[PDB]
Symmetry: C3
């Protein structure tokens, strides 16, 4: 037993969990969020930031920034936030070439802090992406990733949970960065 290695998805956790953050109002805990790029853009659910006097974001490595709302799309309950990149921001691994398949193992990473991670599969490929991984306020707005750590979706609320396919989330983010809502 000692020589052999336990089955684990910790690899995906190490690669992806650093990029998932807390999101607060100023002090209340709103929900989770995901760092998408070095520029300092962050995706979260619209309902999380719907009534925020001031928005604060907290990484797992201890850093704490203030975020400004870039914009939101009601239809997808998504919202993009912006923060100053110190130089060295942890970003969510993304693979635009990866094709999500039904039955793929997925971890739902959320940060209501500690950090909570649940495991499931893709029930139905994205309409949105379905998974039997628990999706709750604690991980709403966080990332859904495969065993590799590659972003599959953004966890959203409202036995089956829902995430927004990463391809669509990318596109919505871009269009929100350029135009606004």
């Amino acid at each position: 037993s000692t020589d052999e290695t336990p089955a684990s998805y910790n690899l995906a956790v190490r690669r992806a969990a650093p990029a998932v953050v807390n999101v607060y109002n100023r002090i209340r805990t709103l929900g989770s969020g995901v760092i998408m790029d070095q520029r300092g853009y962050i995706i979260t659910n619209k309902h999380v930031i719907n009534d925020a006097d001031q928005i604060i974001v907290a990484l797992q490595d201890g850093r704490v920034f203030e975020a400004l709302l870039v914009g939101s799309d009601s239809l997808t309950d998504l919202a993009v936030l912006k923060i100053n990149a110190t130089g060295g921001l942890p970003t969510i691994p993304i693979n635009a070439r990866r094709v999500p398949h039904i039955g793929d193992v997925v971890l739902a990473i959320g940060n209501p802090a500690g950090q909570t991670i649940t495991q499931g599969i893709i029930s139905a490929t994205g309409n949105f992406l379905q998974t039997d991984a628990s999706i709750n306020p604690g991980n709403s707005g966080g990332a859904l990733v495969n065993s590799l750590g590659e972003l599959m979706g953004i966890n959203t609320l409202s036995g089956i949970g829902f995430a927004i396919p990463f391809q669509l989330a990318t596109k919505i983010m871009d269009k929100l960065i350029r135009d606004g809502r």
Copy 2:
């Protein structure tokens, strides 16, 4: 990440999901079902077909047949249906030599349409077979299969779900084909 392959049970989905079908009344959605053989026999739960004026079955590939009730067993809540085989029916993979073991990974495949798939293990080998895979109306009457795609059980209703061991389901089906109920 791009070079490497995600952990997935999609293999089992491709092998088994084609054989799981919808079941309707004529238009209401009754539940799920499983194609067992080329002859055109289909297992579903008795409660699904309990009050059907007319029974319709819908495959994932787009075909739609009418089904006639062969018979049912109250004790197992099972029911066998019959449809004309076009020539080329997708059937549920079965291995009579395979011995289900506790801890075996299993996918519960149901078709309330899209098609919903959940993942778990065998908690207790069949009394019936137990699994922590979600078993709900959406997948009641559908198939439970291992990572290979081999039929383990027929999902049934009434944290733990229940499926009827494929060995018993086979036997009950045969006896219903010969005698009736």
Copy 3:
């Protein structure tokens, strides 16, 4: 399909399930328990044994002993029991060198009898250890183990379940064996 082997965690079940036992009052079913050593010591939840006129323990191999309460810690809801070792007691595999990581696959083994086993991962490493494996009265007081079979925690009550890290459980047990509560 027949040549190939199903994905399974049955290995861990065979190695660990023998050591998980039933716990009764004398006849009511109280909960689950875990055999820790050849001496005949057994960990269970304090709430399970809180009001026991007489305590009985039942192994999976058919043997039935009476147990005496060594002591308990309210804070961890743990309780150590003692039974005469026949010679050949099945004990829960323990690895003091093993470091539990987030994302590790874990089976929650409980014995409300049959024996119920559920699967999940470590959401948060132990405060206590979190897992999305179902933790219910049926498996409260039982073992949580990895794919190897190595004890990770003692399942406890009160979408996320809780287990007491095996390192802490070991220490609490020792201190209860020496002093009492």
